[PDB]
Design a protein that fits this description.
The structure is a homodimer. By secondary structure, chain A is of the alpha+beta class. The N and C termini of chain A lie far apart (47 Å). Bound molecules: potassium ion (2 copies). Chain B: GO terms for molecular function: metal ion binding; RNA binding; RNA-directed DNA polymerase activity. Chain B: Keywords: Antiviral defense, Magnesium, Metal-binding, Nucleotidyltransferase, RNA-directed DNA polymerase, Transferase.
Chain lengths: 289, 293
């Protein structure tokens, strides 16, 4: 089934070209993206054999700390360029499968989708009267997700045990989500060939629960806002959805950072919101950083 | 639909109800007649059939747009041309029929004022081009489209597809009325533009001629309304593209290049759709983020 699709010459050549295009910092092995071509010419068949027999061992991600202007630090986990290549090859096959399942109001790390589309959808909801915002803050997905629960969800769709095996090994390696979009940055995420898709597979369960409740929401990776018509309803939604996230998905809601507010109080994907009194419409613009 | 008999599609109950709903959803400031968007429904109950019949015989008279000055969030003033709500309604009714026709003609690297497209998509496509080595940027600055477009040239282009003379007639009257493009995207703003039910589509119909020419020449570009950047691999090639494409825009489309603001530059010198570009030292890549305003 899927492993041979992932390892096909066609898919691997596409993954190689993408990873070279994406460049990026070296992982723990010190290998630069400019060395991948020659490395694969020598070792590509060995690597394919190891993957086929479940003996390929991903390298741990390299932890990189980047200063944020507000005095915080952004954490990045950089896979080796070989692992970015394999992750890309996996994602190229898994992405079309899951695109058929995903909700139209999920916008993070998906083909032809971006943060601005989430903003515009949320604005339309706000301007329809749903201007009480439920802003649920989750602890970092890959710091808190239970690997068994995630792999079980993935297993509902993906029956190839060889693919299951290697995806689990990448979770263990420390793959994570580059959150630079929170600073309004646009561009290729570092270390994100596969981890954002895996987060979306899990969080698609939240999308389905919110759709079952008839809620108006947008989501970008693990950052969701829900648009509601009244404070009382927003408080109920906050309580019910936070309970679902913790009990069903096994994720962790930071209740202190989560809040109900009006749009002026919301910071989302680098944007803030304001009421344009000429247009008589909420609009959005980059918030101060 | 039949492109020779579109006026009755524009005036159909279904199309007009949709246009009414969208104009009310867009809200907006009043035009020169002082009519609020909440007053449109009662006005159309009395005058809707009158307006339809006037349009059928080319006797409907658009009102001039209202010049409205509003603050920009970060300082300074934005000038808008606000049609009356009746004219926003008719403009929307026309655009609802013309948009699906032209969406099938448009280039995938045109992103301004189109359904499900946005500025960030143009930025992402441009970054991919820059990171593939095309980091000499041709930045042609055009004077405001509706201040400079030749009405006959624009109607000629539209008439290649739209054969309904009654639709041609009303679109031309809307040009004279002063419809324009809300430029708040230049300030990184996301939201409903004012006065833009029809004007941005008309600009895209014209500028689609430029897109086809650039594609014929194999150029890497993105465009958002009348703001286009072209990604080239060398300074020499950029200067050549600048010369050739500026000539095409002025000679074939009749638009106006601003000499002093057009330039060839590297990504760090480009301001586009509210974004600047920078070289991320860790990623060894160009990325974008909002520029200082
Ligand atoms: K949130
Ligand atoms: K330009």
């Amino acid at each position: 089934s899927l492993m041979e699709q992932i390892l096909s010459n066609d898919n691997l050549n596409r993954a190689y070209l993408q990873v070279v295009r994406n460049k990026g910092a070296e992982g723990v092995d010190g290998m630069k993206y400019t060395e991948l071509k020659e490395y694969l010419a020598k070792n590509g068949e060995i690597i394919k054999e190891q993957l086929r027999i479940r003996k390929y061992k991903p390298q741990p991600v390299r932890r990189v700390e980047i200063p944020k202007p507000d005095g915080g630090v952004r954490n990045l986990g950089v896979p080796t360029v070989t692992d970015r290549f394999i992750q890309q090859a996996i994602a190229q096959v898994l992405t079309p499968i899951y695109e058929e399942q995903f909700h139209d109001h999920s916008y993070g790390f998906r083909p032809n989708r971006c943060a601005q589309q989430a903003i515009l959808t949320a604005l339309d909801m706000m301007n329809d009267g749903n201007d009480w915002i439920v802003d649920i803050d989750l602890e970092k997905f890959f710091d808190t997700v239970n690997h068994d629960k995630l792999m079980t969800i993935i297993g509902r769709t993906i029956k190839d045990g060889d693919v299951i095996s290697i995806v689990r090994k990448y979770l263990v390696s420390g793959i994570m989500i580059d959150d630079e979009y929170e600073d309004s940055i646009v561009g290729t995420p570092q270390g994100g060939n596969l981890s954002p898709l895996l987060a979306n597979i899990m969080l698609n369960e939240l999308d389905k629960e919110m759709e079952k409740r008839g809620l108006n929401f947008v989501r970008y990776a693990d950052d969701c806002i829900i648009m509601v018509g009244s404070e009382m309803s927003a408080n109920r939604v906050m309580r019910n959805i936070s309970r679902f996230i913790e009990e069903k998905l096994g994720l962790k809601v930071n209740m202190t950072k989560s809040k109900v507010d009006r749009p002026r109080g919301i910071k989302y994907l680098g944007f803030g919101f304001y009421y344009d009194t000429s247009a008589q419409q909420f609009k959005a613009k980059p918030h101060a950083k």
